[PDB]
Enzyme design. Sequence first.
Site, PDB file in Angstrom:
ATOM      1  N   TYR A 199      -7.795  56.334  42.617  1.00 43.21           N
ATOM      2  CA  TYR A 199      -6.663  55.762  43.379  1.00 43.21           C
ATOM      3  C   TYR A 199      -6.793  54.249  43.566  1.00 43.21           C
ATOM      4  O   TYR A 199      -6.125  53.661  44.419  1.00 43.21           O
ATOM      5  CB  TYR A 199      -6.502  56.420  44.766  1.00 43.21           C
ATOM      6  CG  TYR A 199      -6.440  57.935  44.765  1.00 43.21           C
ATOM      7  CD1 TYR A 199      -5.812  58.628  43.740  1.00 43.21           C
ATOM      8  CD2 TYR A 199      -7.020  58.669  45.793  1.00 43.21           C
ATOM      9  CE1 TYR A 199      -5.768  60.015  43.737  1.00 43.21           C
ATOM     10  CE2 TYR A 199      -6.985  60.052  45.801  1.00 43.21           C
ATOM     11  CZ  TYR A 199      -6.360  60.720  44.770  1.00 43.21           C
ATOM     12  OH  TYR A 199      -6.318  62.091  44.769  1.00 43.21           O
ATOM     13  N   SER A 246       0.429  66.200  44.483  1.00 48.25           N
ATOM     14  CA  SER A 246       0.211  67.474  45.174  1.00 48.25           C
ATOM     15  C   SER A 246       0.547  67.418  46.669  1.00 48.25           C
ATOM     16  O   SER A 246       1.696  67.189  47.035  1.00 48.25           O
ATOM     17  CB  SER A 246      -1.193  68.037  44.914  1.00 48.25           C
ATOM     18  OG  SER A 246      -2.201  67.211  45.459  1.00 48.25           O
ATOM     19  N   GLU A 259       0.299  73.043  35.241  1.00 48.92           N
ATOM     20  CA  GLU A 259       0.075  73.004  36.670  1.00 48.92           C
ATOM     21  C   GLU A 259      -0.891  74.074  37.179  1.00 48.92           C
ATOM     22  O   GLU A 259      -1.635  73.831  38.122  1.00 48.92           O
ATOM     23  CB  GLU A 259       1.419  73.102  37.399  1.00 48.92           C
ATOM     24  CG  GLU A 259       2.296  71.881  37.212  1.00 48.92           C
ATOM     25  CD  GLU A 259       1.774  70.662  37.975  1.00 48.92           C
ATOM     26  OE1 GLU A 259       0.792  70.795  38.754  1.00 48.92           O
ATOM     27  OE2 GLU A 259       2.353  69.566  37.799  1.00 48.92           O
ATOM     28  N   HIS A 271      -3.550  70.130  36.665  1.00 49.93           N
ATOM     29  CA  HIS A 271      -3.144  69.543  37.929  1.00 49.93           C
ATOM     30  C   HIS A 271      -4.018  68.330  38.289  1.00 49.93           C
ATOM     31  O   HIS A 271      -5.249  68.411  38.250  1.00 49.93           O
ATOM     32  CB  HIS A 271      -3.294  70.630  38.988  1.00 49.93           C
ATOM     33  CG  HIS A 271      -2.661  70.302  40.297  1.00 49.93           C
ATOM     34  ND1 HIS A 271      -1.300  70.172  40.450  1.00 49.93           N
ATOM     35  CD2 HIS A 271      -3.205  70.105  41.522  1.00 49.93           C
ATOM     36  CE1 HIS A 271      -1.029  69.902  41.716  1.00 49.93           C
ATOM     37  NE2 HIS A 271      -2.168  69.853  42.383  1.00 49.93           N
TER      38      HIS A 271
HETATM   39  C1  E20 Z   1     -13.838  77.092  48.674  1.00 45.80           C
HETATM   40  O1  E20 Z   1     -12.850  78.038  48.373  1.00 45.80           O
HETATM   41  C2  E20 Z   1     -11.700  77.636  47.683  1.00 45.80           C
HETATM   42  C3  E20 Z   1     -11.557  76.321  47.269  1.00 45.80           C
HETATM   43  C4  E20 Z   1     -10.405  75.921  46.570  1.00 45.80           C
HETATM   44  C5  E20 Z   1      -9.412  76.833  46.294  1.00 45.80           C
HETATM   45  C6  E20 Z   1      -9.560  78.182  46.717  1.00 45.80           C
HETATM   46  C7  E20 Z   1     -10.719  78.560  47.413  1.00 45.80           C
HETATM   47  O2  E20 Z   1     -10.933  79.842  47.861  1.00 45.80           O
HETATM   48  C8  E20 Z   1      -9.971  80.808  47.751  1.00 45.80           C
HETATM   49  C9  E20 Z   1      -8.308  76.155  45.554  1.00 45.80           C
HETATM   50  O3  E20 Z   1      -7.260  76.693  45.190  1.00 45.80           O
HETATM   51  C10 E20 Z   1      -8.667  74.699  45.321  1.00 45.80           C
HETATM   52  C11 E20 Z   1      -8.638  74.297  43.843  1.00 45.80           C
HETATM   53  C12 E20 Z   1      -8.387  72.792  43.601  1.00 45.80           C
HETATM   54  C13 E20 Z   1      -9.553  71.921  43.953  1.00 45.80           C
HETATM   55  C14 E20 Z   1      -9.334  70.467  43.654  1.00 45.80           C
HETATM   56  N1  E20 Z   1      -8.843  70.179  42.293  1.00 45.80           N
HETATM   57  C15 E20 Z   1      -8.807  68.779  41.886  1.00 45.80           C
HETATM   58  C16 E20 Z   1      -7.679  68.008  42.555  1.00 45.80           C
HETATM   59  C17 E20 Z   1      -7.879  67.400  43.801  1.00 45.80           C
HETATM   60  C18 E20 Z   1      -6.839  66.685  44.418  1.00 45.80           C
HETATM   61  C19 E20 Z   1      -5.599  66.582  43.783  1.00 45.80           C
HETATM   62  C20 E20 Z   1      -5.387  67.189  42.527  1.00 45.80           C
HETATM   63  C21 E20 Z   1      -6.424  67.894  41.920  1.00 45.80           C
HETATM   64  C22 E20 Z   1      -7.784  71.112  41.895  1.00 45.80           C
HETATM   65  C23 E20 Z   1      -8.146  72.550  42.123  1.00 45.80           C
HETATM   66  C24 E20 Z   1     -10.023  74.551  46.013  1.00 45.80           C
END
Ligand code: E20
Lengths: 530, 535
Positions: free
Chosen positions: B130, B200, B329, B442
């Site tokens: 960023y 997001s 996505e 994403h």
């Molecule tokens: C710890 O448990 C969990 C942790 C997470 C989920 C479910 C969980 O449990 C059910 C999710 O669904 C998340 C998945 C995203 C994590 C970050 N990234 C990178 C990103 C960050 C910021 C903006 C855009 C992309 C995308 C996937 C984290």
Amino acid sequence: EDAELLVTVRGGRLRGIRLKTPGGPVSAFLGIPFAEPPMGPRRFLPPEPKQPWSGVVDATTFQSVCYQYVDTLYPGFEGTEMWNPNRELSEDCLYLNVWTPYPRPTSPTPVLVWIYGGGFYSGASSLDVYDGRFLVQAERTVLVSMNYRVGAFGFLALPGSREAPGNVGLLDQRLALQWVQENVAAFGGDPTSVTLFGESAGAASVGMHLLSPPSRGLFHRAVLQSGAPNGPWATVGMGEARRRATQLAHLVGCPNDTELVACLRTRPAQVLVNHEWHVLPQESVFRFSFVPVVDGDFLSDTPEALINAGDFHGLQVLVGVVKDEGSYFLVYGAPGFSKDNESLISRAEFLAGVRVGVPQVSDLAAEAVVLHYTDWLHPEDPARLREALSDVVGDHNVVCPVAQLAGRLAAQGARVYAYVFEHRASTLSWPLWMGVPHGYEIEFIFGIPLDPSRNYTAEEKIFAQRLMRYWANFARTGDPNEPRDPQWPPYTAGAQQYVSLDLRPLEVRRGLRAQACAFWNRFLPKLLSA
Amino acid sequence: EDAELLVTVRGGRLRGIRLKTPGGPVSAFLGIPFAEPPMGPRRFLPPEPKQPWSGVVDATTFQSVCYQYVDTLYPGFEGTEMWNPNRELSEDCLYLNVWTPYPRPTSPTPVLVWIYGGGFYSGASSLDVYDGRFLVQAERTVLVSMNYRVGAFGFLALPGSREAPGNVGLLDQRLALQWVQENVAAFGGDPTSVTLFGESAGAASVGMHLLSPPSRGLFHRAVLQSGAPNGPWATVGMGEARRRATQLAHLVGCPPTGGNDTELVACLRTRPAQVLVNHEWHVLPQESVFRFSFVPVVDGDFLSDTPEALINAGDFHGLQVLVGVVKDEGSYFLVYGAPGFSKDNESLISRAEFLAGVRVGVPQVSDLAAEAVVLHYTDWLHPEDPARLREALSDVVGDHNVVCPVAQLAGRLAAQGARVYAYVFEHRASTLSWPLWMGVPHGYEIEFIFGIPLDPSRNYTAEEKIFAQRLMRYWANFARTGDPNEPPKAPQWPPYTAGAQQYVSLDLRPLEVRRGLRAQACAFWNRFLPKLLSA
Ligand SMILES: COc1cc2c(cc1OC)C(=O)[C@H](CC1CCN(Cc3ccccc3)CC1)C2
Ligand SMILES: *[C@@H]1O[C@H](CO[C@@H]2O[C@@H](C)[C@@H](O)[C@@H](O)[C@@H]2O)[C@@H](O[C@@H]2O[C@H](CO)[C@@H](O)[C@H](O)[C@H]2NC(C)=O)[C@H](O)[C@H]1NC(C)=O
Ligand SMILES: *[C@@H]1O[C@H](CO[C@@H]2O[C@@H](C)[C@@H](O)[C@@H](O)[C@@H]2O)[C@@H](O[C@@H]2O[C@H](CO)[C@@H](O)[C@H](O)[C@H]2NC(C)=O)[C@H](O)[C@H]1NC(C)=O
Ligand SMILES: COc1cc2c(cc1OC)C(=O)[C@H](CC1CCN(Cc3ccccc3)CC1)C2
Ligand SMILES: *[C@@H]1O[C@H](CO)[C@@H](O)[C@H](O)[C@H]1NC(C)=O
């Protein structure tokens, strides 16, 4: 006198007639009585076997058409008239016809039995398009077709009652099949090799005989053209059958089931016919008032259930559809449709059309139909709306019930062959937008193009000949295929293979509208159950 | 002292830092306090404006990351670590950053305000991806970004109570926006030309500011990348928010379930930040992906009704919006809980795993609803083909959470007065460490929008550098004029409308115009499925 045209059956003696075809003569026995005339106190009752006669029955001409509605949508138009009664109407209509090679086969010949369609409200064995002479000559089979009671006369039901038990038209068919078992040998036919074939309500009938044990011993193979017993139009529940019967009585001035039927029995046949369409609960197409009823007797359960739970090892079936199953029906009730224009409808007409093509479902269910059948990049394009509504009516009423039948039968031990018939007759007088409409493969199966006094092309004649060979091969062996040279593979629930039938050589394809039929067969029931 | 690096804002004096960029110097003021620290008694409470100070505050480095969960799924993997906090965790985190050209602009300059994503549970304005230096240098705008509270600290809600009213993270954002109005002129920025952009959860935040009157006066244009306020993850109802809040308290011993709100919150305030964070994921009612425990609450205050409702019933004349999605996505989310998935293999799942994944990706809906999803995403000629199933589950998660909510917002906004532009981002970075099966996942357009490929220390191709410059140009043009198009022979980016539904593909090749944002799929999610849930 001609000894070939004299036959003795169990009930007495018959005289037939010699007929010509371009391939040589054929023997025909037309208007053979197989039941007592179901008249007066016998109206609405199961058929009784025809009592023996003395002397010689004249079997040289078609007998009366069972009492039925006469289609007046386009008076004079060949496209509607070719399906209308071509002999006088009568309740004394339970006759069957036998065509056989000339001279009569002197050894057991495979038998084809034709059951006509017409939504269970109409049809006749005497129709031009069902002429057996060409199949018998070309493929050397014996061909039998019967008349059976239609409309209220064959299917009015007050479930539980003795005076109108329902399904008697189906019993008319069974009695004819029993007649074949007992008498067909006298014509050269082999009672141990009987193949049923039928179209639309005829196909549904074939399927119902498959699912009813007392019929199952009367034949060996089955062909279902553009129809299935599990179609949403092909059966009705006990409750609704009773309501429809009760409303008919009211509409014709009748009032206890015994009294109700007794009053109905006093009415001229034509009077029942005149109010037939009025017992339908909602505005619709592809729905008919008096159809087979699921009452635990002829059908011990719904055909859907009986299909899903059946063991079909030992069975071979040929099933198929035309290219455009739904188009024909749109001109009988869908807003904006006509055979005389392009029927380029609006989105609003399409939406109203959906409730007509899919009557008596919830708004939610209708919404789901609109979702699946809208192209959301072109939601308002008239031509696409026309095609899509055709697809709705066709998938819902024919294609998906046939697909489901084929899948379950194949997965439960049967060998299934599937086709889509994709040739538009050069002689067809319905507009081009209808494509290949419901009913228009039949004339090809019967080899009608071979008739010199009709206007088919040379290629069309060859095509008819191919079709007759596929059908008769199937009757003979349970396999439509000729000796190797492209092969027609069996349909299975997984690969879902079928062939296209047209002027071009066979082409193998996958999926009877699999995406659309997943909706009708897998999802939509779940929705309705909630 | 250097005059360029000295600025007076309403609260007092500031000293910044001169940054080098490939194209020349930029002034940066990093870590400017905009609120009093939400410490102790101020936890869960709306932010208070920063009190004025004497002397000079050094705005010379990013301040602390707001307290948050740290992603441990693939320890040491750059794909996951790049999103994790890169400063220390602290509840003392309400600071913003201003980048401006060097020398400071002579005349008022259009301002871009970045709002980071991260599911409302994570994220920070300090992340390398960023870095606003390149946009400011390439396009001569002023760039602002702020930190805002996330997780329980920003969004735990006991609706009704004064002690944890919810939505304080969105109030953090608004306060920063007010700060931009009062102060951005001092840096040479134009408070009459302010364009919000976020990705997001940041995009969803941008959308919520659009739907909330007190925010609406603070900006002029909006950009929503891969997110929408109407997404099924982006808000929660009053009762579900209370249930999650109450369960969290319970899991950490408060009170010694429910009771007086004032007391429950007071007990929560005595717990160490890390203790709250350790139990955050436990309050989700069902197994899921793309669901986050503490998110904006629809409580009638910040959001007077659901975002869906507010969108449907709003006048958007005079508004220009740029919206879009990446090509894939959904794929990213599958390795966080869908059975059979891994970044380390092909994730060629079975039909059974697909069916199970559907309930994970579309949690808390009826069996009938799930069956409807299976119907629309199964290819019935190939119902069991592993690769197709993998792609299908991706589409399910991606359509349901991002593409269809974005499409719905785009269509309603267009049909109700707004000029809308829409993209699909289709370039997969040469440096991407996530496996090929994930496609363009994403979050991976951001680095290009910020011009990160111009960073010499990184190993992007020359084309990627050219591509980055194009994107920055589009975004800044939109910021400046409300229209991303170059004010020649270049292919034009047409408005998106409810009927034609036109959008452009953004990749190495020139703009290609296309129709429909997953239209057939989105008709299912936006038009039919809600009717099924009402019945
Ligand atoms: C710890 O448990 C969990 C942790 C997470 C989920 C479910 C969980 O449990 C059910 C999710 O669904 C998340 C998945 C995203 C994590 C970050 N990234 C990178 C990103 C960050 C910021 C903006 C855009 C992309 C995308 C996937 C984290
Ligand atoms: C195509 O025709 C339909 C049917 O209309 C009938 O047939 C036409 C050839 C013409 O003779 C009409 O006058 C007939 O009524 C048209 O739909 C009808 O539109 C009329 C008004 O003209 C209306 O009163 C009826 O409700 C409609 N009938 C039905 C079946 O809905 C339709 O407009 C024509 N479509 C075109 C022009 O492409
Ligand atoms: C693809 O990988 C998943 C995830 O498993 C992890 O990653 C692999 C690369 C390997 O190192 C595994 O040992 C890791 O656990 C596999 O799904 C797992 O299967 C195992 C049993 O084999 C099971 O214990 C886990 O619960 C599963 N995890 C999930 C998320 O379902 C999957 O089977 C792999 N696919 C293959 C090898 O075809
Ligand atoms: C009089 O009212 C109605 C009459 C009909 C309908 C609805 C009606 O009201 C709602 C229909 O849905 C029927 C439409 C069929 C009529 C016969 N043909 C030809 C054919 C006959 C036999 C086999 C194959 C094709 C197909 C369309 C008739
Ligand atoms: C909750 O407890 C506080 C602290 O004593 C008190 O002031 C407040 O009124 C209580 N609320 C209720 C409704 O019990």
